[PDB]
Design an enzyme around this catalytic site. Structure first.
Site, mmCIF file in Angstrom:
data_model
loop_
_atom_site.group_PDB
_atom_site.id
_atom_site.type_symbol
_atom_site.label_atom_id
_atom_site.label_comp_id
_atom_site.label_asym_id
_atom_site.label_seq_id
_atom_site.Cartn_x
_atom_site.Cartn_y
_atom_site.Cartn_z
ATOM 1 N N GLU A 153 6.514 40.374 23.225
ATOM 2 C CA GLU A 153 7.617 39.996 24.127
ATOM 3 C C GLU A 153 8.904 39.547 23.425
ATOM 4 O OE1 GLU A 153 6.315 37.358 27.197
ATOM 5 O OE2 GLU A 153 4.845 38.805 27.982
ATOM 6 N N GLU A 176 -0.553 43.000 28.733
ATOM 7 C CA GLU A 176 -0.781 41.813 29.543
ATOM 8 C C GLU A 176 -0.446 42.118 30.992
ATOM 9 O OE1 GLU A 176 0.939 38.533 26.286
ATOM 10 O OE2 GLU A 176 1.322 38.219 28.427
#
Ligand SMILES: OC[C@H]1O[C@@H](O[C@H]2[C@H](O)[C@@H](O)[C@H](O)O[C@@H]2CO)[C@H](O)[C@@H](O)[C@@H]1O
Ligand SMILES: N[C@@H](Cc1c[nH]c2ccccc12)C(=O)O
Length: 311
Positions: free
Chosen positions: A133, A247
């Site tokens: 991320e 995720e």
């Protein structure tokens, strides 16, 4: 080839709230050997292992990673691999790098050289993931991440010429930022994104957000999931890259039936689009396993691993 290595990722789960905290157990989950068997027996083929190396590496060159911490990652890699599971080893939280990519570059590239050299002989069931991320200054200028990921890939490739390497876009691995992602000409890349839309639902009551979304939010399916996953599939086809959604999940402060609706809807659409995936996460506040009772959370597990294909 890389499409087959991505397909081998299949269904997976994150060992979260563990090695990506400041230290193992700080966020509530210490790893145990028994986790690997549990996860394999429940129908998963892959462990995603979030690791926040920054807490454990020297601040001055050569930025050496603490040997005891490194040995713990060795243990996780070996125990997953011997027990037949794939394992994705990443660099996870790294506030310093997201805030100042240029200043932190040397330390990040040293960390990757250490990881890559140490694990260069691991089998193909061991995958590397360059940076969880990207955000911060990478959101301000996504080309900073394109430049940096090429440098990290180059470091990895000096010792691991063909290992699958997992790379995502900025915006916290937002599929909408795939448009700005640029990747080297390397045939062993898997592209990743994360899926938590709507954050108001999946992260309701999550204190680590600012602002904190209010709770009491329910969810049912409309068209957003299908629209998102089709966009990502067309990007993947246009760029001839396989996709791993590393995720997705909904926090326990949401009502369970909504979380189950959302989890199954997402898993179903991921598999329709031939995306491998890893659920967030095994045992904590998004968990499918309750260590206190040593029981699976059956409604959520069955949304991930249904007993019939249309359930
Ligand atoms: O605390 C800031 C940091 O938290 C991370 O979320 C953790 C959280 O700290 C922990 O208390 C809770 O139990 O689980 C969540 C998810 O692991 C968050 O991922 C970071 O982005 C954030 O900087
Ligand atoms: N090795 C310790 C202490 C340390 C040595 N040299 C440093 C330079 C800057 C900051 C910390 C240090 C650390 O990385 O934290």
């Amino acid at each position: 080839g890389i499409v087959e290595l991505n397909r081998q990722l299949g269904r997976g789960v994150n060992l979260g709230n563990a090695l990506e905290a400041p230290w193992e157990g700080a966020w509530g989950v210490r790893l145990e050997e028994g986790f690997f068997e549990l996860i394999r027996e429940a129908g998963f083929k892959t462990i995603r292992l979030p690791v926040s190396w920054t807490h454990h590496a020297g601040r001055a060159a050569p930025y050496t990673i603490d040997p005891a911490f490194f040995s713990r990652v060795d243990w996780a890699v070996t125990q997953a691999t011997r027990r037949g599971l794939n394992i994705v080893v990443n660099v996870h939280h790294y506030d310093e790098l997201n805030a100042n990519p240029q200043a932190e570059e040397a330390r990040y590239l040293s960390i990757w050289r250490q990881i890559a050299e140490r694990y260069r002989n691991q089998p193909g069931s061991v995958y590397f993931e360059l940076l969880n991320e990207p955000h911060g200054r990478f959101n301000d200028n996504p080309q900073l991440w394109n430049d940096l990921l090429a440098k990290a890939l180059r470091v990895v490739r000096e010792s691991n010429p063909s290992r699958a390497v997992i790379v995502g876009p900025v915006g916290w691995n937002s599929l909408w930022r795939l448009s700005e992602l640029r990747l080297p000409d390397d045939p062993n890349l898997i592209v990743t994104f994360h899926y938590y839309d709507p954050l108001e639902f999946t992260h309701q009551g999550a204190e680590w957000l600012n602002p904190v979304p209010p709770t009491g939010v329910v969810w049912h399916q409309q068209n957003a999931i299908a629209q998102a996953m089709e966009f990502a599939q067309r990007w993947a086809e246009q760029n001839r890259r396989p996709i791993f959604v590393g995720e997705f999940g909904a926090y326990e402060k949401g009502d369970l039936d909504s979380r189950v609706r959302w989890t199954g809807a997402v898993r179903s659409e991921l598999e329709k689009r031939n995306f491998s995936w890893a659920y967030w996460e095994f045992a904590a506040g998004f968990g499918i396993y309750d260590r206190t009772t040593r029981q699976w959370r059956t409604p959520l597990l069955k949304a991930l691993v249904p007993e019939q294909p249309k359930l």
